[PDB]
Design a protein around this ligand. Structure first.
Ligand SMILES: O=C(O)CCC(=O)C(=O)O
Ligand SMILES: [Mn+2]
Length: 202
DNA sequence: AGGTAAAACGT
DNA sequence: AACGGTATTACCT
């Protein structure tokens, strides 16, 4: 059974690339550090975030926004690493989205207890483009639902190297991550990373 | 008129 | 602890 219409999980797809990906996460973060963003309502997110590529996802007083500038450094987000771009292209192709051209990569870091409550990815103007989501390090339970928040959820464990792609009919589906269980991973030690690639501009 | 925050407490 | 209320509103543009 496939994940959903237009959605697939490619288990361990990024396993072989993982060590290089993690080195490049560290390189990106050395320029635009991980930070826990504050919601418009004033709550600090448990996930720590940074971005690379032309556009980075951020919170603002006024809402959510894709911006070419890191508001913490006041400099452009770091360029998207070639390792990221290549892995993304290969995964998108395997998932049936060969033409995907991301201009944005959000890097999520989960410490024990960190979560991402059910939400839609909808700040992108071109919804024809899929989301490509790469898991690294400790395992997490990914929720994948429907167009409505109360639509029944699938819960899938995402392990190191797993890639999830959604788009088309499932592009706007609600999804999230349940509070991260503590553990050990030889490459990330005590955390999970996720890379989410999007076409956020035009 | 439409977009939209909640990507965030009680049972 | 899985499910669902809340935005059933108050602001922007
Ligand atoms: O960490 C994940 O697997 C999901 C991340 C996510 O939903 C997002 O970046 O919008
Ligand atoms: Mn998301």
């Amino acid at each position: 059974e496939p994940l959903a219409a237009g959605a697939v999980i490619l288990r361990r797809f990024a396993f072989n690339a993982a060590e290089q990906l993690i080195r490049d996460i560290n390189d990106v973060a050395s320029q635009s550090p991980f930070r826990q963003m504050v919601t418009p309502g004033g709550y600090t997110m448990s996930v720590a975030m940074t971005n690379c590529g032309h556009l980075g996802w951020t919170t603002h007083r006024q809402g959510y926004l894709y911006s070419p500038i890191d508001p913490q450094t006041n400099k452009p987000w770091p360029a998207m690493p070639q390792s990221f771009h290549n892995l993304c292209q290969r995964a998108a192709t395997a998932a049936g989205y060969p033409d995907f051209q991301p201009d944005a990569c959000l890097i999520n870091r989960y410490a024990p207890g960190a979560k991402l409550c059910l939400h839609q990815d909808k700040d992108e103007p071109d919804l024809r483009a899929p989301i490509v989501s790469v898991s690294l390090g400790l395992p997490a339970i990914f929720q994948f639902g429907g167009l409505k928040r109360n639509d029944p959820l699938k819960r899938l464990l995402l392990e190191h190297g797993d890639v999830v792609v959604w788009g088309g009919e499932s592009r706007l589906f609600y999804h999230g991550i349940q509070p991260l269980k503590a553990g050990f991973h030889p490459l990330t030690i005590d955390c999970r990373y996720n890379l989410t690639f999007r076409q956020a501009g035009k």
